[PDB]
Design a protein around this ligand. Structure first.
Ligand SMILES: Nc1nc2c(ncn2[C@@H]2O[C@H](COP(=O)(O)OP(=O)(O)NP(=O)(O)O)[C@@H](O)[C@H]2O)c(=O)[nH]1
Ligand SMILES: [Ca+2]
Ligand SMILES: [Mg+2]
Ligand SMILES: [Mg+2]
Ligand SMILES: [Mg+2]
Length: 166
């Protein structure tokens, strides 16, 4: 079976861990425990083939973000996550895109832009603004909620499959 190495990046608190845990373990993490670097692995059938997903859940807090670059190196595709109620996290997305380009030494890396926390009503990033950013990068934009599960499989499966196009 084919192995896909996925990496989830973005600012502190945007819901990287909650997204990954919802996908892999089918529950919502309500509390906020900042991540250093965690890994998850699971076999799943995507569009008709058994896939081993290896998912690296990275730190968004700068204090916990030491050595993030080395662990990301083997990443084949990246989820770049912001929260729709956190304008700064959206403005921060370029930092992550630049880091990915530097770790992979490439301008053509499989990626998906994810607007998380779409269940929340205090939206400050409109869908259209994020679509425009994604278009500039040549990548999909998908909204998610780790709380309700909306879009969660779609985000990770879009990623696994952008990889199949490269
Ligand atoms: N309402 C709502 N809350 C969410 C969602 N995703 C995450 N949260 C909440 O936001 C907080 C931070 O989530 P977490 O997944 O830890 O964020 P992170 O991006 O992994 N943080 P770090 O970079 O420090 O590891 C938690 O309280 C979590 O419940 C979501 O889709 N909706
Ligand atoms: Ca819970
Ligand atoms: Mg985390
Ligand atoms: Mg490099
Ligand atoms: Mg505005």
């Amino acid at each position: 079976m084919t192995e896909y190495k996925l990496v989830v990046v973005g600012a502190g608190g945007v819901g990287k861990s909650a997204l990954t845990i919802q996908l892999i373990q089918n529950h919502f993490v309500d509390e906020y425990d900042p991540t250093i670097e965690d890994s998850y692995r699971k076999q799943v059938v995507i569009d008709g083939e058994i896939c081993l997903l290896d998912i690296l859940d990275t730190a968004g807090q700068e204090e916990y973000s030491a050595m993030r670059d080395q662990y990301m190196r083997t990443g084949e595709g990246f989820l770049c996550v912001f929260a729709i109620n956190n304008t700064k996290s959206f403005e921060d997305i370029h930092q992550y895109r630049e880091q990915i380009k530097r770790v992979k030494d490439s301008d053509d890396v499989p990626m998906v832009l994810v607007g998380n926390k779409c269940d929340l009503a205090a939206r400050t990033v409109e869908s259209r603004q994020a679509q425009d950013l994604a278009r500039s990068y040549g990548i999909p934009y998908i909204e998610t909620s780790a709380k309700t599960r909306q879009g969660v499989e779609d985000a990770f499966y879009t990623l696994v499959r952008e990889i199949r196009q490269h």
